[PDB]
Amino acid sequence: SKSFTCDQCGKYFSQKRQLKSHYRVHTSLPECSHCHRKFMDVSQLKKHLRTHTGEKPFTCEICGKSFTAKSSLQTHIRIHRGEKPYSCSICGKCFSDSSAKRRHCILHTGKKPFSCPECGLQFARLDNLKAHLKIHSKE
DNA sequence: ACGCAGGTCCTGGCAGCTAA
DNA sequence: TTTAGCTGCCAGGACCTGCG
Ligand SMILES: [Zn+2]
Ligand SMILES: [Zn+2]
Ligand SMILES: [Zn+2]
Ligand SMILES: [Zn+2]
Ligand SMILES: [Zn+2]
């Protein structure tokens, strides 16, 4: 039987100490000593430390470029192989990169939630508002 | 003559498996 | 058997880039 339940997510636990440890994920969590960012688990903190190091241990066998993560390398490989598995249901365009497909499908919605604070022009992507504000920086 | 969007890789989050 | 650590996989984002 499980008698200790979490308030926010509702998970059950056999002992209260296990509930106290889990509840730190809704609040004392592991924190990076350099940038002071808090992380859910300890393994995620471990992987975050590699961003401070700058090391790239996953090397592409074809071109020789290296990546900070193994899923980045798998994605990169599909570019070499011309594999485009992700396709837009509406416009039919295909992508090797799953984030490129996701970003593309937002355009079919026409939502523009980023508006320029100087001139009021609306943007669908935050990157494009960033560049437009650079133009406003004349002098 | 600049907004638009596609290319490319970096970051962090969980589910599920697996080693301690 | 329990549990912590590990991996795959994924959503989101930043930065560059040429096109119309
Ligand atoms: Zn909870
Ligand atoms: Zn840090
Ligand atoms: Zn390559
Ligand atoms: Zn489309
Ligand atoms: Zn503006």
Same domain, A55 and A108: no
Same domain, A56 and A45: yes
Question: Distance between CA atoms of A44 and A58, rounded to whole angstroms?
Answer: 18
Same domain, A72 and A114: no
Same domain, A96 and A118: yes
Question: Distance between CA atoms of A2 and A18, rounded to whole angstroms?
Answer: 11
Same domain, A49 and A3: yes
Which nucleotide shows the minimum CA-to-C1' distance to residue A17? Answer: C3
User: Domain containing A127: what range?
Assistant: 82-139
Question: What residues have a C-beta under 5 A from ligand 5, the ion?
Answer: A 116, 118-119, 121
**Domain limit, last residue, from A33, A49, A81:** A81
Same domain, A109 and A55: no
Do the beta carbons of residue A2 and residue A12 sit within 8 Å?
yes
Same domain, A8 and A55: yes
Which bases of chain C are under 7 A from a protein CB atom? 3-17
Which nucleotide shows the minimum CA-to-C1' distance to residue A100? Answer: B6
A19: nearest Cα among A32, A36, A2? A2
Same domain, A17 and A40: yes
Domain count within chain A:
2
Question: Distance between CA atoms of A104 and A94, rounded to whole angstroms?
Answer: 10
CA A136 to chain centre: 29
Method by which the coordinates were obtained? X-ray
